[PDB]
Design an enzyme around this catalytic site. Structure first.
Site, short mmCIF file in Angstrom:
data_model
loop_
_atom_site.label_atom_id
_atom_site.label_comp_id
_atom_site.label_asym_id
_atom_site.label_seq_id
_atom_site.Cartn_x
_atom_site.Cartn_y
_atom_site.Cartn_z
N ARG A 118 4.71 -3.85 8.90
CA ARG A 118 5.42 -3.31 7.77
C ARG A 118 6.79 -3.89 7.64
O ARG A 118 7.68 -3.56 8.45
CB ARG A 118 5.51 -1.78 8.08
CG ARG A 118 4.06 -1.29 8.29
CD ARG A 118 3.99 0.17 8.63
NE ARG A 118 2.63 0.57 9.03
CZ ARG A 118 2.17 1.80 9.11
NH1 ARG A 118 2.93 2.85 8.78
NH2 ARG A 118 0.91 2.03 9.49
N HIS A 122 -10.94 0.99 3.69
CA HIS A 122 -10.02 0.14 2.96
C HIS A 122 -10.74 -0.82 2.07
O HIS A 122 -11.79 -1.36 2.37
CB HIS A 122 -9.17 -0.62 4.04
CG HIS A 122 -8.14 -1.52 3.44
ND1 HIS A 122 -6.93 -1.03 2.97
CD2 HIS A 122 -8.13 -2.82 3.19
CE1 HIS A 122 -6.22 -2.03 2.48
NE2 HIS A 122 -6.92 -3.14 2.60
N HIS A 137 -2.99 4.43 5.46
CA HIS A 137 -2.97 4.42 3.99
C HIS A 137 -3.34 5.80 3.46
O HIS A 137 -4.08 6.54 4.07
CB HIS A 137 -3.92 3.43 3.41
CG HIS A 137 -3.54 2.04 3.79
ND1 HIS A 137 -4.33 0.98 3.72
CD2 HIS A 137 -2.32 1.61 4.26
CE1 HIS A 137 -3.67 -0.12 4.12
NE2 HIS A 137 -2.43 0.24 4.45
N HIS A 158 3.71 -5.43 3.40
CA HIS A 158 3.34 -5.96 4.67
C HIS A 158 3.61 -7.43 4.88
O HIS A 158 3.77 -8.24 4.00
CB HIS A 158 1.85 -5.73 4.93
CG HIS A 158 1.49 -4.31 5.15
ND1 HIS A 158 1.40 -3.71 6.38
CD2 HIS A 158 1.08 -3.38 4.22
CE1 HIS A 158 0.99 -2.45 6.23
NE2 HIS A 158 0.81 -2.25 4.92
N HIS A 205 -9.00 3.04 -0.35
CA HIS A 205 -8.13 4.21 -0.15
C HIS A 205 -7.36 4.35 -1.46
O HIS A 205 -7.10 3.37 -2.14
CB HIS A 205 -7.07 3.86 0.91
CG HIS A 205 -7.63 3.53 2.24
ND1 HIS A 205 -7.16 2.49 3.08
CD2 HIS A 205 -8.62 4.15 2.91
CE1 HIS A 205 -7.80 2.56 4.19
NE2 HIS A 205 -8.70 3.54 4.15
N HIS A 211 1.33 4.55 1.88
CA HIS A 211 1.04 5.16 3.18
C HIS A 211 1.19 6.64 3.05
O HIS A 211 1.83 7.15 2.12
CB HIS A 211 1.94 4.59 4.28
CG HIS A 211 1.45 3.19 4.66
ND1 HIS A 211 1.05 2.82 5.90
CD2 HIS A 211 1.17 2.16 3.87
CE1 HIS A 211 0.64 1.55 5.88
NE2 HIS A 211 0.73 1.09 4.63
N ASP A 252 -4.40 1.84 -1.72
CA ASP A 252 -4.63 0.42 -1.68
C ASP A 252 -4.34 -0.27 -2.99
O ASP A 252 -5.23 -0.38 -3.83
CB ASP A 252 -6.12 0.11 -1.37
CG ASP A 252 -6.49 0.49 0.01
OD1 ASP A 252 -5.62 0.64 0.92
OD2 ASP A 252 -7.70 0.66 0.28
N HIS A 269 0.81 -1.21 0.00
CA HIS A 269 0.00 0.00 0.00
C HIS A 269 0.85 1.26 0.00
O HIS A 269 1.99 1.22 0.43
CB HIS A 269 -0.72 -0.01 1.37
CG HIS A 269 -1.50 -1.25 1.70
ND1 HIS A 269 -1.49 -1.85 2.93
CD2 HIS A 269 -2.38 -1.95 0.98
CE1 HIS A 269 -2.29 -2.88 2.95
NE2 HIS A 269 -2.84 -2.99 1.76
#
Ligand SMILES: [Ca+2]
Ligand SMILES: [Ca+2]
Ligand SMILES: [Cu+2]
Ligand SMILES: [Cu+2]
Ligand SMILES: [Zn+2]
Ligand SMILES: [Zn+2]
Lengths: 151, 151
Positions: B141, B69, B61, B118, B78, B46, B81, B44
């Site tokens: 993360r 999400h 995000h 992630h 988002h 951030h 995403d 994603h």
């Protein structure tokens, strides 16, 4: 974007965190750098935020206006020319610069670009060599980081 | 900016390089990530390009439209995403995504923000708990990098 942050890291011990904040028509740059040899070190915004080949891939100083290398108070300077930072005996350089040319938005936006701290002092384009009019003879790039948007 | 690049690094072995290119009206994301466990991993953008506390300081995000999400194909998602990337048995994930919401300039610009890979699969906003609607239960993360301008 009104705040920005850069985490400087290199192949050596130089390391540091720079904070940028847009105040009026200036950008206030602060933070500290450590692991530096006492003295003056060239401190510039390089054109690309490309760290795929270390600080090497950051390109030349950010010079949207195609000017010559100068120091911060000069009119003929690259937008990226923020002059020099000074490491004390302990290797610590405290950054506190107020610059009216660099920006956190628009055309001179430095977001996504690289902050580089150099091995030697920036001669400010007053070196009497062509190299001086291009980079200030600051030599090698010790640590660098991509300038990102901060909260 | 029509090209951007991000070097992902973490505290572990996960690392990679992600390239972004504005092609037409869309943004093509390519690259590869190594050192991952086999299987899906949330991927994603951030909000902050703040690597001062590793990837934790990247924030949530990137979500300029204030949505919940979702997966990259959902209307409710988002802007950051990008779903999951998938690591083969050797831990290599090849990235190839075309996304209609991210951009390299303007309001949806991801330049100066952070790309995060992630620990777990992103459940695409369908796990049924509140955490799913925020992060997809993608967990910690593994690696991240600030998205910078490339040549
Ligand atoms: Ca040198
Ligand atoms: Ca986890
Ligand atoms: Cu420089
Ligand atoms: Cu995420
Ligand atoms: Zn210069
Ligand atoms: Zn999300």
């Amino acid at each position: 974007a009104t705040k920005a942050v850069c985490v400087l890291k290199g192949d050596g011990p130089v390391q540091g965190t720079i904070h940028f904040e847009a105040k009026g028509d200036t950008v206030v740059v602060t933070g500290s750098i450590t692991g530096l040899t006492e003295g003056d070190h060239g401190f510039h915004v390089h054109q690309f935020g490309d760290n795929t080949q270390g600080c090497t891939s950051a390109g030349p100083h950010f010079n949207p206006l195609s000017k010559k290398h100068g120091g911060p108070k000069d009119e003929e300077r690259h937008v990226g020319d923020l002059g020099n930072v000074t490491a004390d005996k302990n290797g610590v350089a405290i950054v506190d610069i107020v610059d009216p040319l660099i920006s956190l938005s628009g055309e001179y936006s430095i977001i996504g670009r690289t902050m580089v701290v150099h091995e030697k002092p920036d001669d400010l384009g007053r070196g009497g060599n062509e190299e001086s009019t291009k980079t200030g003879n600051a030599g090698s790039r010790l640590a660098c980081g991509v300038i990102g948007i901060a909260k």
